[PDB]
Design a protein around this nucleic acid. Structure first.
Lengths: 194, 131, 159, 85, 80, 121
RNA sequence: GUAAGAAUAAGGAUCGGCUAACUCCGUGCCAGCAGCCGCGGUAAUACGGAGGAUCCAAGCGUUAUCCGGAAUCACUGGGUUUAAAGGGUCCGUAGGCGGUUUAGUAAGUCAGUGGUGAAAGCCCAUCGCUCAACGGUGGAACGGCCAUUGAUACUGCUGA
RNA sequence: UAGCUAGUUGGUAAGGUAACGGCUUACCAAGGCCACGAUGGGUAGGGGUCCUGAGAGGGAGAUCCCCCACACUGGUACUG
């Protein structure tokens, strides 16, 4: 399933615009609710800190707790940095790459364009948002819905995107020092090892 | 006695705790081999094999720093005991002090260290370990 | 160091019985560390919580200790008792995380360790477990230190 | 009579057979003697992985192939090689 | 041939006609505490002329079953 | 202690006696009630808790506690015991599922509807 | 592949501490709640209802049976003065342990080789189902056992 | 649960079974097991495996595969 709800609320309950720094991030930036607008609780537990740091990443991309735990224990099979490979495989998702390529300016629109047979991956059309893009994939756009109204309206360090043929040539898997995200993976690892 | 090796280790441990200089342990082939290994590894200053006894003595000089003495022998214990003998091939050797300590292993060639025997790919019996 | 950050481990309310009634009082334990090399714990006793915490951090600012944390964590495995508690610290990796208890986690995050496994097979008193962690952390000597103490080059301690 | 037959081991909808020599009095996908080859009729070429070093050995020892077995061992060899005396 | 099994034991009692019983001791490691335990087992061997007596050290070999609970024979008497 | 003592007689592991025993290790058990009455807690609570003597299908007489308010529970009714003791009534070690075969649910309940067997309004 | 149409589709648990989330109204030790501490005797963040908040999500809670936390049967990895724990004290059978040196065998121990340790299953790597589940292939593993060839430092046996 | 076994323990000759063998019979001797648990009672098909656990361990033996036992409750033989 998906969230399918207010995104400004999710941005306010975390204090960080993860769906685009735009309207409503200011103008009562404090968390929502009749008791969040007032002086919140001062003492915040480390469990609350770790849980919210996990939920920030779980909400930014649109992953459920089940799939997030599956991906975490999948990435934990790598002998390297567990949080690093976790974030790498979370960024390697198809909808995330489509969102980073400029199309679908939000991930909520990425996981509505990728789930409509509007985008192709290495030839055959792949309409699975959770598709794991391995380094060295070729993402194109279906010629039927190539000249749409929203695609051209909406149109990184590792994505080589070409606007003439809707290219993007996903290669050179990025690292934590390159992926811009305000999340701490060590806290997520400690929470899942709790 | 019940374990001359345990007594040999206990005398050294007690002297280190009491801040002594020399020890006058009784002698035997195994104790001499352990003393040679310890002197080669650099845990004792010197050793002398004193004659004129029916068994013989071993006079060992304990090593401390020239300032903030801090004896280099912090924990010297046994793994194999006369009530339970523990052997291991050249795959189950201990990891004493995460590679910073030594583990004496009596091998088919002779008395070696846990790291000096894994290169030769021989097993044997772990006698003791020193930090 | 200079950029010292504090962390309150536990605040416990005590009481002394007198002829009139109950004489309350607050005690606080605060561990302050530079997050890189130095850390120190302190105890503060007062009547107000803020005054107790202030006295605790002011007393913990003194007697700071230096701890070797080779690479990103402890160099080897070590045990520390200090009476009731019994803490056992083991290094894991460069990306594992701090798997510690309630009061050991604060000390290991204030000293500057980022990947270690600590098991507290003992009591659950914040007064004693912090000192047990300190006793287990001060007995750690790095490879250079053991090599200098032995007198052997830093290759025979490895081979 | 030891026979050379097929064992189904694929998934529902897409079969995948093991060409194996087994006794006739055993279940289809159960006990066998020695795996010989592999048959995949999911592509147009109908891929096979016959082992002519043991196929002819079993045929000499007294194996008895079935229709599909002797049709797989036909266009992969070991039959025109088992005939040569 | 195939070199059938062979054991070495100590004669325990000779009170039967043309047959002896020996005991064999082995040191096997404990499955939990790793301490070597001395376990015993008594075999029944075949004797022809009733030569060995109690307290000897014999060597028996496994053969076809010559009788119920009797599948060994003495071949290599060593010490008396 | 001694390795020889452990080799002779090892460590004795206990069986960890169970909690709910009179239900034959089943999640729920059908039963018929014989006496529906009210009892008092021990201390310092003060109430009138509703309990029923239920005879399970395996020939076991137990005391079950009726949760919530509103029920019929006549002198003979088919109930479904599930388990879960209470720290107020000495002897009552079981609970009755609300919403079972013959027992009633609850009316006017809107918060905890999964429990107490209440349909969605 | 073609043609209308956001149309045909979101609920459960929790909000005193453990543990993530607080305000009001009604009852006044009653009705009730409860995994432990325990709450309600008329200003209840703990009972019922309303609003808001948190978690999970085509699922959510309870029960029943297991492992972990439990170092709470401890070989790894606990104790016996006062918290449960030294037999009332000796002798001694079976058993357990063994001062120094030396010669022999190699039973334990260590190393190599051959056979076996079915297939399936777990893990790793790679391919086909649009991904995954699933399936194919390969390796590792199966900590074990039998035969044989060596080493003799330590334990066992024989002799001095 | 401290004694159990009387064809029971070993042998000598026959009858035998696909095949050795107290498998059976005739004769001689009193042997055989047992505290390293016989005997007796309760429970239970066994394994590859599944769950959990850092590991050592602990708890079960559905579905897939191998071995064993049974076919209303018991006994017996024929064909092959």
């Amino acid at each position: 399933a998906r969230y399918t709800g207010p995104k400004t609320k999710i941005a306010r309950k975390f204090g960080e615009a993860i769906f685009g720094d735009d309207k409503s991030f200011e103008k009562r930036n404090y968390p929502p609710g009749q008791h969040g607008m007032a002086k919140k609780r001062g003492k915040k537990s480390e469990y609350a800190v770790q849980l919210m740091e996990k939920q920030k990443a779980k909400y930014s991309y649109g992953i459920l707790e089940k799939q997030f735990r599956n991906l975490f224990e999948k990435a934990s099979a790598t002998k390297g940095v567990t949080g690093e490979v976790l974030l790498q495989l979370c960024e390697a998702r198809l909808d995330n790459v489509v969102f980073r390529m400029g199309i679908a300016p939000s991930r909520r629109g990425a996981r509505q364009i990728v789930s409509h047979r509007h985008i192709t991956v290495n030839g055959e059309v792949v309409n699975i948002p959770s598709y794991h893009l391995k380094p060295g994939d070729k993402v194109a756009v279906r010629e039927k819905s190539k000249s749409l109204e929203a695609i051209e309206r909406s149109l990184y360090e590792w994505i080589t995107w070409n606007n003439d043929l809707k290219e993007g040539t996903f290669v050179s898997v990025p690292a934590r020092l390159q992926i811009p995200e305000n999340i701490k993976e060590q806290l997520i690892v400690e929470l899942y090892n709790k | 006695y019940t374990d001359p090796i345990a007594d040999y280790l206990t005398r050294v441990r007690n002297a280190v705790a009491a801040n002594h200089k020399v020890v006058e342990i009784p002698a035997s082939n195994l104790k001499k081999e352990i003393t040679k290994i310890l002197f080669d590894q650099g845990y004792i200053l010197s050793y002398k094999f004193e004659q004129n006894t029916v068994q013989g003595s071993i006079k060992i000089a304990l090593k401390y720093d020239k300032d903030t003495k801090e004896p280099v022998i912090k924990d010297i214990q046994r793994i194999s005991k006369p009530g339970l003998r523990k052997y291991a091939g050249a795959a189950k050797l201990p990891r004493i002090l995460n590679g910073l300590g030594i583990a004496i292993v009596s091998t088919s060639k002779g008395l070696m260290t846990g790291k000096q025997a894994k290169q030769l790919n021989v097993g044997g019996e772990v006698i003791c370990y020193v930090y | 160091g200079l950029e010292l950050k504090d962390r309150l481990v536990s605040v416990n309310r005590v009481t002394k019985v007198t002829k009139g009634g109950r004489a309350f009082g607050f005690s606080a334990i605060v561990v302050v560390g530079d997050e890189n090399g130095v850390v120190g714990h302190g105890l503060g006793k007062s009547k107000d919580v803020s005054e107790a915490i202030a006295k605790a951090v002011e007393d913990a600012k003194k007697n700071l200790v230096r701890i070797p944390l080779n690479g990103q964590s402890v160099p080897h495995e070590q045990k520390g008792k200090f009476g009731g508690a019994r803490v056992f610290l083991i290094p894991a990796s460069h990306g594992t995380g701090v798997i510690a208890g309630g009061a050991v986690r604060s000390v290991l995050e204030s000293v500057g360790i980022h990947d270690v496994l600590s098991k507290s097979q003992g009591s659950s008193n914040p007064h004693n477990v912090v000192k047990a962690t300190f006793d287990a952390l001060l007995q750690m000597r790095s490879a250079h230190t053991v090599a200098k103490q032995r007198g052997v080059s830093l290759e025979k301690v490895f081979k | 009579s030891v026979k050379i037959r097929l064992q189904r081991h694929g998934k529902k909808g897409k079969p995948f057979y093991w060409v194996v020599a087994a006794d006739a009095r055993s279940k289809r996908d159960g006990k066998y003697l020695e795996k010989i080859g592999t048959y995949n009729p999911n592509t147009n070429p109908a891929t096979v992985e016959l082992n002519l070093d043991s196929i002819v050995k079993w045929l000499h020892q007294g194996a008895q192939p079935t229709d599909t077995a002797r049709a797989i061992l036909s266009y992969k060899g070991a039959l025109l090689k088992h005939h040569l005396d | 041939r195939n070199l059938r099994k062979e054991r070495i034991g100590v004669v325990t009692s000779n009170k039967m006609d043309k047959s002896i019983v020996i005991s064999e001791v082995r040191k096997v490691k404990h499955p939990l505490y790793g301490k070597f335990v001395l376990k015993t087992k008594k075999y029944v061997a075949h004797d022809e002329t009733n030569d060995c007596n109690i307290g000897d050290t014999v060597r028996i070999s496994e053969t076809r079953p010559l009788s119920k609970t009797k599948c060994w024979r003495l071949v290599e008497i060593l010490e008396r | 202690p001694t390795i020889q003592q452990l080799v002779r007689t090892g460590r004795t592991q206990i069986t960890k006696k169970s909690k709910s025993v009179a239900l034959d290790s089943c999640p729920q058990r059908r039963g018929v009630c014989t006496r529906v009455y009210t009892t008092t807690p021990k201390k310092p609570n003060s109430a009138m808790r509703k309990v029923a003597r239920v005879r399970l299908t395996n020939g076991n007489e137990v005391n079950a506690y009726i949760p919530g308010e509103g029920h019929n529970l006549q002198e003979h009714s088919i109930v479904l015991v599930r388990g879960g003791r209470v720290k107020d009534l000495p002897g009552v070690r079981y609970h009755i599922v609300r919403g079972a075969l013959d027992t009633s649910g609850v009316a006017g309940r809107t918060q905890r509807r999964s429990k107490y067997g209440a349909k969605r309004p």
